Symmetry: C3
Amino acid sequence: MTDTNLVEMRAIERMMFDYSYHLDMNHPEELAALFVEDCEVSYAPNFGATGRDAYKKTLEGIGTFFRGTSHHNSNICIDFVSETEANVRSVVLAIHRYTKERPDGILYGQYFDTVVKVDGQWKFKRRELRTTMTTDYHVRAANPIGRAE
Amino acid sequence: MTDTNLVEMRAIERMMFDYSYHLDMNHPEELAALFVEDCEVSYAPNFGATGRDAYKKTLEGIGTFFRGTSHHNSNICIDFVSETEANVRSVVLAIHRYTKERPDGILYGQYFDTVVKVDGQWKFKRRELRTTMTTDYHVRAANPIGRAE
Amino acid sequence: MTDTNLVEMRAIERMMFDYSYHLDMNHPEELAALFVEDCEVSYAPNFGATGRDAYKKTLEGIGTFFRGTSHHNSNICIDFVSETEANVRSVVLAIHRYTKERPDGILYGQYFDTVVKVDGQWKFKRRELRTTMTTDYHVRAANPIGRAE
Ligand SMILES: [Mg+2]
Ligand SMILES: [Mg+2]
Ligand SMILES: [Mg+2]
């Protein structure tokens, strides 16, 4: 209902923010706690993770290849399938300060997510990053946003 | 009432996000569907649109002059006139990757909007962009924010 | 309760946005009206303000040292202590266009705040800025975010 939808929108947004916080803090175990076992992550047509352990592996090196990151998540649009499943579209600005000497790398992106509520906690079941564009960035492959020509 | 205000704040924000999404996707018809016929848009003291058809014309070339854009909308403040009319103030970060060879153009702005609810959908009745500042941008004229000196 | 929490989350966010607006507008008296007398502000281990008058002093020169600023506040996480006291964590992107000839200065930060509700208005009781990183910026000292190594 209305009440349920409003409260859960807040909870979903909070989880997404906790995710970005723990990412900028280099807390990979906290990050993995926000994904179900049977998850999928897609960062490019030939790059992602199937299942939580594979996802954990994608987190390796956050602490070593970057001196810092800053994630700014906005434009969050939530459509409930049910009270324990929602589809989310959002915008991300992610700045990366590398450990190697090179300009900061900027990702302008969209996330297409499905989140599920389990034992009182929202978690990611699927995340699909679509890359709007990048600057001085370290990843070449990407899922396009599908901009009309 | 309280309940009404909360639900409609979510709906207004969703519409604003759908707008920015369809803009970054180069979907001008979806954009125009989010404006009433009797709308006004102001981007500079001598630049805007009176009525929806004129607004549609301002969308020409999105696909040709830019390879991509990314809009990040935040700091959304909503004051209800009534349950079907609200005044909104918000902040925008808009990055533009040009089709011509030149640095990305950055707009730091404020939107002063009036939105109205018609047949279940929020739409823009007025948008006024105030330009806080810009970098490497393609538009010179602007409405100032009115910063105190 | 639920209803209270939702309404007050909106009010707290609104206050935070009003703060950033008045800051970008160079309105120091409006800013100071959003702090209690017995406040604390921490921007670095050896830099801040104890009490509202000291805070007011930190606002001196906004109009003179910058031609403009733009603050984008996102990722707002609110934990209520009570219905009139909350702890907030948020992300900030703050761009500064200097009056002196130098590149824009960018702050990527986190705010750790305690807000209190007094006579119907949320106000800051404590703000602690943690600096994720900066670019071409004018402040060297900072409170670290505490990123895991
Ligand atoms: Mg295991
Ligand atoms: Mg017609
Ligand atoms: Mg006094």
